[PDB]
Amino acid sequence: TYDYLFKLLLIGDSGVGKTCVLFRFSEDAFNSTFISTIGIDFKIRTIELDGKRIKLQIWDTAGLERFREITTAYYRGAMGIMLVYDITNEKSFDNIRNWIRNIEEHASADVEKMILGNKCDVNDKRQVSKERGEKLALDYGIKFMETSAKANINVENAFFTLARDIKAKMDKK
Amino acid sequence: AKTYDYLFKLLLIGDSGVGKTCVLFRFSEDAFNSTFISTIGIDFKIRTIELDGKRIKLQIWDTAGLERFREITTAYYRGAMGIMLVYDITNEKSFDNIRNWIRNIEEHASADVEKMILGNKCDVNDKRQVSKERGEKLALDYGIKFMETSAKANINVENAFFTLARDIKAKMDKKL
Amino acid sequence: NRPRFTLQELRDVLQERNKLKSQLLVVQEELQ
Amino acid sequence: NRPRFTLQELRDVLQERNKLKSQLLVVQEEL
Ligand SMILES: Nc1nc2c(ncn2[C@@H]2O[C@H](COP(=O)(O)OP(=O)(O)OP(=O)(O)O)[C@@H](O)[C@H]2O)c(=O)[nH]1
Numbered sequence: 057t058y059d060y061l062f063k064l065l066l067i068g069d070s071g072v073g074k075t076c077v078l079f080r081f082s083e084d085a086f087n088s089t090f091i092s093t094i095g096i097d098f099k100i101r102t103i104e105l106d107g108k109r110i111k112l113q114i115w116d117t118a119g120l121e122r123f124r125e126i127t128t129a130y131y132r133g134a135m136g137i138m139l140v141y142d143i144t145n146e147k148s149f150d151n152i153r154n155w156i157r158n159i160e161e162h163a164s165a166d167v168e169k170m171i172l173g174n175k176c177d178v179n180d181k182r183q184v185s186k187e188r189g190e191k192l193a194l195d196y197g198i199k200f201m202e203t204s205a206k207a208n209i210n211v212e213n214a215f216f217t218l219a220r221d222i223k224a225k226m227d228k229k
Numbered sequence: 230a231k232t233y234d235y236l237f238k239l240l241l242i243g244d245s246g247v248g249k250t251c252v253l254f255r256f257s258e259d260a261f262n263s264t265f266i267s268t269i270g271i272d273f274k275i276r277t278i279e280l281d282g283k284r285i286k287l288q289i290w291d292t293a294g295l296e297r298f299r300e301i302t303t304a305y306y307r308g309a310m311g312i313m314l315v316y317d318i319t320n321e322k323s324f325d326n327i328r329n330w331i332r333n334i335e336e337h338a339s340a341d342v343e344k345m346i347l348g349n350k351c352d353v354n355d356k357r358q359v360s361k362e363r364g365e366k367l368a369l370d371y372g373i374k375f376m377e378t379s380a381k382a383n384i385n386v387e388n389a390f391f392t393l394a395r396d397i398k399a400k401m402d403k404k405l
Numbered sequence: 406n407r408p409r410f411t412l413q414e415l416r417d418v419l420q421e422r423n424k425l426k427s428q429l430l431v432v433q434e435e436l437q
Numbered sequence: 438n439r440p441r442f443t444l445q446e447l448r449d450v451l452q453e454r455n456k457l458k459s460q461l462l463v464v465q466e467e468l
Pocket residue numbers: 068069070071072073074075076077087088089090091092093094117118119120174175176177178203204205206207
């Protein structure tokens with residue numbers, strides 16, 4: 057079983073790679089087919105940290121506006137949130153500010169947040185340099201990583217870092 | 230490891246509100262709830278019966294009657310081995326529509342599917358709109374078995390499903 | 406109320422719900 | 438094609454999907 061249950065949430069524009077990032081984390085695989093998420097889904101993975109068993113319940117939101125009411129319901133319980141954009145889609149990067157506003161409206165003020173610039177394997181269509189993602193995260197005081205579900209870059213690192221940071225804050229209380 | 234010797238796929242069709250879900254609730258849970266919760270698309274329930282010393286798993290698909298769900302429900306006709314066509318004896322229009330449901334079976338189901346017409350709500354005869362004679366005559370005209378049922382009063386619900394399943398099994402045994 | 410979701414969207418969720426119901430029964434098999 | 442179903446209609450199926458998912462994980466573990 058486990059010692060802690062961490063509820064995580066993936067948010068961001070439709071098509072940025074939220075489901076594929078989660079599929080890489082839970083199944084260590086990637087497929088190029090786009091199957092847009094209908095409302096919400098979740099996956100479970102249990103990890104070991106500093107002697108404790110951590111059950112991660114990871115909620116995967118649909119990015120399209122028609123699912124707003126469905127996805128809004130999951131901000132309240134969230135202990136960590138991944139804000140995902142697509143490095144080949146500057147509009148999805150600009151929309152990170154809107155996703156942050158939704159976190160501030162509906163999530164706890166102490167929620168752990170991390171920005172993921174996904175699809176970093178697609179440099180031939182890049183629209184956002186990594187420095188711009190780092191600066192956005194810095195201004196919000198949160199961590200940033202460029203990830204690739206396809207090339208298996210920083211997906212494990214992102215989730216373990218978020219869980220470590222949640223555990224560290226919790227342990228200190 | 231298998232908990233059955235045969236698996237039969239059954240299907241309930243008919244107008245919204247005639248009692249398809251209540252008939253299945255009576256069959257699979259032996260209970261009745263009068264609060265109408267109209268089916269969203271499709272659902273199914275399981276009951277395993279014994280015929281000729283064989284374990285028969287009945288997987289019973291319960292369709293929504295409302296026109297808005299037709300596109301969802303018609304995909305479940307093809308695999309059906311037996312189909313209950315349900316009307317409400319207090320609702321003449323649901324009885325008239327049996328001819329339309331028969332046409333939908335011809336279009337979407339297997340040519341040799343077993344069929345049975347259920348005139349449901351036979352516990353409420355004060356509000357009865359369709360005589361038993363008229364129900365028998367319609368079924369005779371189409372060459373289909375007929376029973377009047379009541380999910381509320383527990384009349385002929387087991388009889389209907391047992392009979393349909395026996396008819397499916399006899400044909401399977403006929404082809405050995 | 407206001408129509409918001411397509412036939413494909415509802416169908417897909419219904420099929421997953423159906424699949425999970427069957428899977429739940431077959432794991433429940435374990436009455437071992 | 439076009440939108441047809443309501444928020445409550447999709448939601449009720451999603452909630453049941455979620456409940457079955459969680460129940461399946463409990464029984465899978467019981468092993
Ligand atoms: N090259 C490349 N393609 C990716 C990567 N991640 C996701 N994709 C592709 O991008 C498309 C969208 O991926 P999804 O994970 O389904 O997007 P989503 O964010 O879950 O979208 P919604 O569910 O609609 O909110 C799919 O075709 C993926 O195959 C990646 O890291 N590299």
